[PDB]
């Protein structure tokens, strides 16, 4: 039977695997044991599949006697399938729920394709460096869960219950936590009473009652999805003073810092893989392919036209054709024609005038005829096949073929695909050829087409992952999202396309918590067995985001690096060609230092001044001080300019200072129409913070760097804008005037949807309510191109995109209402737009920033030998010294010191800290009195033990050596906050019990990997304090502008501008901007800031709803773009600062080995000094790590022979000093040289390396 196992038997089994995957898609999970005929057949087909994968595992089992992971998966799948079938037939715990193993069968499609197995291994092998970040995330989640347990435990269980009973939550359809008259949170007021006893904001799922519930809430907040909801619930529960310190800090630490770490590690790994695969020379094949194609058409056209110069009438037939295409006039004429085609395509809109629809149909045919004629003219003058040779010419040929195909229909339906004339806009991308960077865009496309095979493999593995998780979700939650609620969920797992859409939505991370809550309630509620189903959503989110990162960052980084290398090589070749061609043919106190400062302080004070204004109250005593305080502030800057204007006559920042001061001074007057002009020059007062530039060195540097980066990435921005415009045109064709709906679902026209109709509260037939029928459009529609660009932008931001998707799926016909699930196949448009724009273009932009930062800097060309290990080795050897030990004396201190400095004591206290953390982690809601007393006494016992440790280590280490390790002063401050915590506990303040949790960081700061990673990234963050000052300034400026513009809108609890979210205070405006930067409901806030809102009663006819502004669109879009750009800039700057650690190659010698050697050497020296023992070398050569020193070889051997053979410094037997022997060890480890090269190293170290300050007098020999 070992004969038929290598023939296409293995392809027969592969086809069997594909038909057990197209039978798990056809399956429809019906609610409550329902079925149909297709399922009745699929059972028998699965029986046949089970028979086949059994006698095929038997042959391999009785052929080779289960070791490989894939064959083990085969075996387990087969056995559980047989077990499930047998148990199902016998019973004809849940029986049918054991069929979830059948979704592992598609995982075998990569075991039969090694080409997919290699990319799977490449994706998997990048997980190992991220395990440290995973551990850090776990620790942060645990710490914040315990803090939330200690802060908000069981404080969100009271809602308004009305003053007639406790029937059910008579506070809107979305009840919120409240507080009593003795509380600080939200007050119900009017005919309501804040009565204790209530499930929770999300049916009791979102709260800090338990440690598991707190951990789930913390994870959901860290994923940045629905964290403002939790923050606002906490604000309503306990108050609006100190939950922002919790939630904002959690968001900053666990979402931005962690993302920075992940991006840095992934970029370092990708760079290492690139530098390892470049040695093979894969770039050469791409390099040699471009020049072979450049000379191809350059020689074929030479052959072509030489035939026409002749020796039938081609002399008067061919010269003009090739002299018109290359005339530079045909180029511009074709560009103008394409511009006209774009003009007529983009002029289409809903309810257009009847003349426009005729103009744009006549012009379409005319331009189609013209472009076909031009294509035919070019088709023969440059060879029929040589015309096909070119890249963009293939695009033109395909566009013409498709246009001719779709313009002759004129009888069939759905003419939306006829608008492939929009891809003709890609042909005008030759406008880059006239300008620069055309060799940077076309090189990118060439690299993409060269690597399309790996691109397809990477995109297919992601599709397989999505298919597997969609099948698993269809099995788990299929036909279960059917509860008694009146509204029907749209994101369900009922079908295969619906499951695919739901899994894609969860992968994008938008409203994934809603699907998680739906899945949790489908299995009961917040209970131990029911709520374990959230593991599916957690794993799906984490793994999908990780896979998307590893795919779309690898593609972008590799392709962009290849394109940049191609461009650099091409530039070098052009330089060499044009050089060799030329090498032959030719042959007043304002200039002070303290003043300046004092006035950059005033500038800071002036910036602080206008942030403290009152946005809403026009007249208030606080503004009396501030309004008259700016008067004296403006005088100082007015005096500053006059004192300077005499010195000279002008730069570009004195212009800005003048534009500030003159505007302020004229604004002091104005009078007359003090409504419009004042409201412009009052918001023009946001330029004062910008005066810190040119007055604070470093701010100017970072601003100039950001401007250079903008100028570099403008090409990618332009290409993304072009693609967005094309997709907007396609969407306008698809959904023009189709996204209208009526409040009454029974009317499908505007004329019908008129008058009143009866609604029922919660669908209770006994409670009818009259409401008016209204013909409404979608929030973001596709009526015209401008209305579609913004809808696509909001889709790309992953904000409210499922709502638009499910609104577009129902649309069927212009001017008519929706139909449930009319065109589910239209979701491919949104999927493709998200993949191309929100996933590929964004990662291309980030990789472009990374590459343009990497090719800057390191290209300083430090070509004074000394490659990228030895400079660091030499500087470390120069900057080194023996360390201290402090070995107790008093012969009594030694005993306690030995006790406290052992490893067993350290491990014992680590276990004690773990036990204390576990004790803190089980403070549930509704605990009994015995539990509380036991917890109190256990906390007392732990704090006593830790005081005992502290006393032991003041003695052992003395009161000077204790407060020397910074881990000790932090420990000292922690426990003293626990001793006096018990003092105030028996007779409150919640701040003092948070010190116990903070002690868990000692466990985190014990592994050499996480410690080094965190330390290096923190140092890189500290070393760049202005890249974050840029974000701070942007936030401040936009907060002030929002306060001035939208600061008067009313706080309506049913609108997105309310008590928790508003512009009425600088902290509140900053919090709103932070929430928008996270991207929570920024589109909803923008729509709530549009003009026509009744607003603040405390500001003072014809003004019914006169406030608001149409500036909101630009405000909220520009803020999003600028915030994303600046955050990416900061991330890449930190990554490039820390890039040395991210690409380390730990196998080779590194500074960590030097640190270990120093820590081994430290104990043998009583002081720093530099005096050693001659016999100490015996243990020195044995204690060194073999990669750093020598292995398990005998001491008195060639190791000692070479140690003594080297010319040591002319010292005594043991008076040689530490840096000398360190340099000797580093030079013997690597970069070895023959005798007589000492002077070469001596002269080299004083040229490129830092100054020695004549401190190497004894190190010369
Ligand atoms: C309150 C929070 C405040 C905490 C401040 C506590 C400070 C404790 C004292 C620290 C002393 C400073 C030294 C220190 O410990 O810093 C780091 C680790 O610490 C963290 O990053 C610690 C990272 C902790 C971050 C997790 C925080 C998450 C929870 C926050 C909750 C906040 C709750 C707020 C909610 C409020 C509710 C209202 C270690 O410092 P290190 O210098 O010893 O580590 C080095 C480093 O790795 C070097 O590369 C290398 O030596 P050098 O080059 O000579 O330095 C050695 O490693 P290699 O040779 O392998 O390279 C190590 O020796
Ligand atoms: C990059 C730079 C920006 C990053 C974004 C960080 C987020 C900033 C969050 C700070 C504002 C959060 C909201 C807030 O502080 O709430 C307002 C609160 C008082 O709220 P109030 O409406 O007066 O409620 C009365 C009932 N107590 O106000 C207060 O009482 C606290 C205000 C403190 C302001 C913080 C400044 C630090 C000093
Ligand atoms: C899809 C991959 C990860 C393999 C499948 C693993 C999961 C989906 C499988 C393996 C173990 C299975 C569970 C084993 C036991 C029980 C308890 C029973 O009362 C209901 C079914 C239930 C709850 C099964 C549901 C499906 C299950 C959780
Ligand atoms: C040539 C390309 C790049 C740009 C094309 C711009 C022109 C054709 C487009 C862009 C925005 C369009 C407008 C968008 C919306 C409106 C409002 C309404 O009254 C219908 C027509 C009108 C006024 C459109 C007319 C055509 C329009 C002005
Ligand atoms: C996502 C995959 C790859 C890994 C996670 C496995 C998931 C799907 C498995 C592991 C544990 C499982 C749960 C274990 C126990 C129960 C309780 C039972 O009364 C209903 C099913 C339920 C709630 C299971 C649902 C499926 C489950 C959550
Ligand atoms: C580094 C720089 C940008 C920090 C700037 C901080 C300034 C703008 C912040 C910090 C503290 C803030 C104040 C904190 C509290 C209040 C009380 C509130 O009822 C009105 C606003 C007011 C009076 C704030 C005004 C703005 C303020 C002074
Ligand atoms: C790593 C571990 C030890 C951390 C802490 C987890 C344990 C101790 C936590 C998590 C889940 C918790 C339980 C979950 C639900 C309830 C129901 C409630 O009415 C009484 C407490 C009780 C029974 C909790 C007791 C403590 C508990 C068992
Ligand atoms: C500089 C960041 O701008 C964005 O956040 C973009 C989003 C939203 O960010 C994508 C988050 N996934 N949506 C659209 C479509 C974009 C646009 O209109 O380009 C002009 C920009 C963008 C701009 C330049 C380069 C890339 C991108 Cl993605
Ligand atoms: C704003 O709040 C008031 C207070 O009850 C309410 O009457 C009004 O309807 C709200 N505005 C809107 C648009 O609903
Ligand atoms: Ca969201």
Instruction: List the Cα angle 134/136/142 in 5-degree steps.
Output: 105
Atom of ligand 2 nearest to the CA of 1073: 5
CA distances in angstroms from 565 to 283, 473, 558, 852, 855, listed in the order given: 8, 44, 11, 12, 10
Enclosing H/E stretch for 559:
helix 534-585
Does residue 147 have its Cβ closer than 6 Å to ligand 1? yes
Q: Which residues are annotated as a binding site for Ca(2+)?
A: 225, 510, 799
- Nearest residue CA, atom 11 of ligand 3? 98
Number of separate helices (H) and strands (E) present in the chain: 50, 6
Query: Does residue 579 contact residue 1012 with C-beta atoms inside 8 Å?
Result: no
Does residue 321 have its Cβ closer than 6 Å to ligand 6? no
CA distances in angstroms from 649 to 442, 645, 665, 1112, listed in the order given: 48, 7, 21, 41
Query: Does residue 562 contact residue 445 with C-beta atoms inside 8 Å?
Result: no
* Sole residue written with tokens 């009146």: 486
- In angstroms, the CA 1143 to CA 1135 distance is 11
- In angstroms, the CA 750 to CA 218 distance is 47
Pure H helices in 586-620: 594-611
What is the 1007 CA–ligand 1 centroid distance (Å)? 11
SS3 at position 202 = coil
Contacting residues for 879 by C-beta, under 8 A, at least 6 apart: none
- In angstroms, the CA 215 to CA 208 distance is 8
The DSSP output letter for 1049 is B
Pure H helices in 104-181: 114-124, 131-151
1080: tokens are 């929570």
The most distant pair of C-alpha atoms in the chain lies apart, rounded to whole Å, by 115
Q: Bridge-partner residues for 835, per DSSP?
A: none
**At what angle are helices 114-124 and 452-477 packed, to 10 degrees?**
80
Which residue of 98, 467, 529 sits with most ligand 3 atoms within 8 Å of its CB, as the best mutation to test the pocket? 98
Please report the DSSP string for 399-447 in residue order.
HHHHHHHHHS-SSSS--GGG-GGGGGGGGGGGHHHHSS-HHHHHHHHHH
Query: Determined by which method?
Result: cryo-EM
574: tokens are 């052009």
- In angstroms, the CA 876 to CA 181 distance is 65
Q: Which residues line ligand 7 (CB under 6 A)?
A: 210-212, 918, 921-922, 924, 926
Does residue 101 have its Cβ closer than 6 Å to ligand 5? no
- In angstroms, the CA 40 to CA 26 distance is 12
Atom of ligand 3 nearest to the CA of 103: 1
Closest CA relative to residue 1005, chosen from 255, 131, 141, 132: 132
Resolution in A: 2.9
What is the 89 CA–ligand 3 centroid distance (Å)? 19
694: tokens are 């040119």
Does residue 232 have its Cβ closer than 6 Å to ligand 6? no
What is the 471 CA–ligand 4 centroid distance (Å)? 44
- In angstroms, the CA 883 to CA 1161 distance is 8
- In angstroms, the CA 150 to CA 996 distance is 11
- In angstroms, the CA 1013 to CA 1016 distance is 5
Query: Does residue 271 contact residue 150 with C-beta atoms inside 8 Å?
Result: no
What is the 475 CA–ligand 3 centroid distance (Å)? 10
Please report the DSSP string for 85-133 in residue order.
HHHHHHT---SGGGGGGGGGGGGGGTTS-HHHHHHHHHHHTTSGGGHHH
What is the 1066 CA–ligand 2 centroid distance (Å)? 8
């Amino acid at each position: 039977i070992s004969i038929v196992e290598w023939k296409p038997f293995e392809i027969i089994i592969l086809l069997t695997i594909f038909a057990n995957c197209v039978a798990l898609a056809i399956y429809i999970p019906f609610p409550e044991d329902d079925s149909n005929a297709t399922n009745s057949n699929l059972e028998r087909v699965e029986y046949l599949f089970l028979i086949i994968f059994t006698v095929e595992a038997f042959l391999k089992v009785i052929a080779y006697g289960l070791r490989n992971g894939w064959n083990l998966l085969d075996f387990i799948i087969v056995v559980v399938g047989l077990f499930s079938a047998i148990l199902e037939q016998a019973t004809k715990f849940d029986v049918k729920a054991l069929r979830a193993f059948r979704v592992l069968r598609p995982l075998r499609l990569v075991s039969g394709v090694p080409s997919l197995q290699v990319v799977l291994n490449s994706i998997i092998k990048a997980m190992v460096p991220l395990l440290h970040i995973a551990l850090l995330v776990l620790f942060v989640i645990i710490i914040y869960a315990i803090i939330g347990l200690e802060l908000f435990m069981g404080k969100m269980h009271k809602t308004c219950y009305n003053q007639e009973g406790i029937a059910d939550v008579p506070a809107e359809d979305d009840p919120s936590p409240c507080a009593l008259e003795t509380g600080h949170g939200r007050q119900c007021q009017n005919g309501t009473v804040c009565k204790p006893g209530w499930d929770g904001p999300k049916h009791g799922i979102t709260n800090f009652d338990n440690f598991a519930f707190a951990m789930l809430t913390v994870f959901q907040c860290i994923t940045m999805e629905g964290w403002t909801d939790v923050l606002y619930w906490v604000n309503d529960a306990v108050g609006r003073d100190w939950p922002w310190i919790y939630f904002v800090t959690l968001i900053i630490i666990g979402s931005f810092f962690v993302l920075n770490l992940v991006l840095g590690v992934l970029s370092g790994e990708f760079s290492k893989e690139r530098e390892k695969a470049k040695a093979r020379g894969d770039f050469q094949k791409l390099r040699e392919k471009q020049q072979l194609e450049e000379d191809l058409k350059g020689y074929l056209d030479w052959i072509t036209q030489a035939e026409d110069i002749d020796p039938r009438w081609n002399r008067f037939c061919r010269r003009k054709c090739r002299a018109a295409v290359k005339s530079n006039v045909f180029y511009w004429l074709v560009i103008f024609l394409v511009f006209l085609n774009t003009l007529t395509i983009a002029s289409e809109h809903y309810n257009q005038p009847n003349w426009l629809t005729e103009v744009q149909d006549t012009a379409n045919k005319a331009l189609l005829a013209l472009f076909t004629a031009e294509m035919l003219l070019k088709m023969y003058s440059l060879g029929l096949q040589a015309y096909f040779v070119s890249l963009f010419n293939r695009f033109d040929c395909f566009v013409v073929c498709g246009g001719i195909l779709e313009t002759i229909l004129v009888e069939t339906k759905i003419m939306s695909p006829l608008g492939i004339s929009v891809l003709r806009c890609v042909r005008l991308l030759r406008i880059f050829k006239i300008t620069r960077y055309w060799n940077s865009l076309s090189n990118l496309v060439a690299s993409l087409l060269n690597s399309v095979r790996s691109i397809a493999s990477l995109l297919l593995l992601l599709f397989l992952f999505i298919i597997i998780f969609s099948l698993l979700g269809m099995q788990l939650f299929g036909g279960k999202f059917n509860f008694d609620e009146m509204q029907t969920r749209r994101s369900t797992f009922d079908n295969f396309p619906q499951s695919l859409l739901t899994v894609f939505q969860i992968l994008t991370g938008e409203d994934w918590n809603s699907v998680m809550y739906d899945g949790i309630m489908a299995y009961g509620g917040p209970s131990f067995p029911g709520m374990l189903v959230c593991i599916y959503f957690i794993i799906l989110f984490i793994c999908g985001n990780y896979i998307l990162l590893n795919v779309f960052l690898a593609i972008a980084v590799d392709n962009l690096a290849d394109a940049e290398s191609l461009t650099s090589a091409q530039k070098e070749e052009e330089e060499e060609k044009e050089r060799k061609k030329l090498a032959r043919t030719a042959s007043r106190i304002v200039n002070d230092t303290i003043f300046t400062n004092l006035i950059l302080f005033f500038i800071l004070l002036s910036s602080i001044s206008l942030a403290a204004e009152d946005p809403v109250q026009h007249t208030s005593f606080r503004n009396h001080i501030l309004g008259n305080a700016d008067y004296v502030f403006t005088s100082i800057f007015t005096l500053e300019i006059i004192l300077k204007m005499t010195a000279y006559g002008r730069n570009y920042f004195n212009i800005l200072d003048l534009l500030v001061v003159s505007v302020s001074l004229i604004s002091f007057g104005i009078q007359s129409s003090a409504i419009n002009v004042v409201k412009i020059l009052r918001v023009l007062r946001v330029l004062r913070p910008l005066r810190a530039i040119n007055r604070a060195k470093g701010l100017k540097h970072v601003v100039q760097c950001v401007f250079v980066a903008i100028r570099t990435i403008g090409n990618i921005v332009i290409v993304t804008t072009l693609l967005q415009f094309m997709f907007a045109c396609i969407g306008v064709q698809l959904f023009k005037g189709k996204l209208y709906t009526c409040s009454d679902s029974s009317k499908q026209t505007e004329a019908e949807c008129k008058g009143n109709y009866i609604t029922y509260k919660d669908g209770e037939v006994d409670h009818p309510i009259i409401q008016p029928r209204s013909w409404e459009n979608s929030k973001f529609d596709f009526d015209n191109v401008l209305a579609a660009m913004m809808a696509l932008f909001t889709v790309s931001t992953f904000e409210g995109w499922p709502e638009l998707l499910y609104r577009s799926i129902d649309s069927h016909t212009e001017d008519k209402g929706p139909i449930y699930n009319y065109r589910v196949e239209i979701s491919i448009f949104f999927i493709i737009y998200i993949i191309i724009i929100a996933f590929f273009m964004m990662n291309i932009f980030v990789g472009f920033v990374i590459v343009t930062f990497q090719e800057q800097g390191e290209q300083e060309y430090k070509n004074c030998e000394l490659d990228k290990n030895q400079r660091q080795c030499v500087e470390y050897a120069l900057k080194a010294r023996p360390l201290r030990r402090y070995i107790p004396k008093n012969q009594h201190q030694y005993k306690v010191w030995y006790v406290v400095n052992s490893t067993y004591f350290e491990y014992l206290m680590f276990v004690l800290i773990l036990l204390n953390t576990i004790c803190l982690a089980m403070q549930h809601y509704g605990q009994s009195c015995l539990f509380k007393i036991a917890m109190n006494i256990l906390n007392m016992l732990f704090t006593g033990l830790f005081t005992v440790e502290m006393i032991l280590k003041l003695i052992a280490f003395k009161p000077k050596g204790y407060f020397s390790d910074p881990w000790n002063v932090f420990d000292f401050l922690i426990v003293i906050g626990s001793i006096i915590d018990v003092i105030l506990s028996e007779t409150s303040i919640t701040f003092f019990r948070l010190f116990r949790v903070m002690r868990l960081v000692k466990l985190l700061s014990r592994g050499e990997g996480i410690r080094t990673l965190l330390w290096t990234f923190i140092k890189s963050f500290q070393a760049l304090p202005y890249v974050a000052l840029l974000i701070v300034m942007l936030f401040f400026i936009y907060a002030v502008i929002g306060m001035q513009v939208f600061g008067k809108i009313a706080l309506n609890d049913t609108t997105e501008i309310n008590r928790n979210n508003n512009f009425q205070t600088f902290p509140q405006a900053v919090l709103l901007l932070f929430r928008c930067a996270t991207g929570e409901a920024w589109q909803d806030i923008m729509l709530a800031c549009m003009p026509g809102k009744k607003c603040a009663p405390e500001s003072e006819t014809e003004g019914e709803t006169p406030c608001g502004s149409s500036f909101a669109v630009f405000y909220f879009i520009s803020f999003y773009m600028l915030c994303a750009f600046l955050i990416i800039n900061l991330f890449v700057a930190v990554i490039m600062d820390n890039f040395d650690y991210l690409t380390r190659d730990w196998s080779i010698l590194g500074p960590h080995h030097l640190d270990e050697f120093k820590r081994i050497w430290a104990e043998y020296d009583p002081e720093a000094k530099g005096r050693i023992k001659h016999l100490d070398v015996v243990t020195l050569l044995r204690r060194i790590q073999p990669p750093l020193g020598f292995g398990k070889l005998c001491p008195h051997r060639v190791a000692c022979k070479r140690l003594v053979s080297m010319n040591m410094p002319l010292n005594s037997d043991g008076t040689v000093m530490f840096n000398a022997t360190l340099f000797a060890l580093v030079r013997t480890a690597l970069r070895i040289k023959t005798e007589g090269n000492l002077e070469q190293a001596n002269e080299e170290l004083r040229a490129i390396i830092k100054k020695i300050w004549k401190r190497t007098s004894m190190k010369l020999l």
